[PDB]
Amino acid sequence: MLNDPIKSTADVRLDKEEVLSLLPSLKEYTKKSKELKETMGQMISDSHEEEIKEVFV
Amino acid sequence: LSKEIYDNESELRASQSQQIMELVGDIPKYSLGSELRNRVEGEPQSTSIERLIEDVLKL
Numbered sequence: 001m002l003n004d005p006i007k008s009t010a011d012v013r014l015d016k017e018e019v020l021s022l023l024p025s026l027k028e029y030t031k032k033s034k035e036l037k038e039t040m041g042q043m044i045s046d047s048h049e050e051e052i053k054e055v056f057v
Numbered sequence: 058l059s060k061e062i063y064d065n066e067s068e069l070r071a072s073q074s075q076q077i078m079e080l081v082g083d084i085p086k087y088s089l090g091s092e093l094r095n096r097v098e099g100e101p102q103s104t105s106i107e108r109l110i111e112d113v114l115k116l
Binding site: 007008009010 | 112114
């Protein structure tokens with residue numbers, strides 16, 4: 001299952017600002033994903049997963 | 058005489074039928090999809106977003 005490209009628009013470029021304003025909840029999903037990745041990275045760095053993964057083998 | 062009158066009027070009608078078929082096309086048929094001409098003729102009774110997407114990129 002590849003990252004399928006957008007269909008051919010016959011020289012109409014992908015205006016990301018217009019389609020981003022067309023789907024305004026995507027910015028809310030983006031900031032929620034940023035907060036989730038921030039909290040998960042804070043959980044990961046506290047757990048020393050890479051540290052105990054690299055000190056063993 | 059009526060046969061010759063009809064033949065002359067058919068010869069006059071030939072140039073008119075060639076001119077009124079060679080007008081501005083105004084985006085004519087046999088160029089759109091099925092759903093575009095079905096929305097032109099009205100009451101399609103079967104909507105399908107995938108065919109609308111695949112036909113709106115063909116205009």
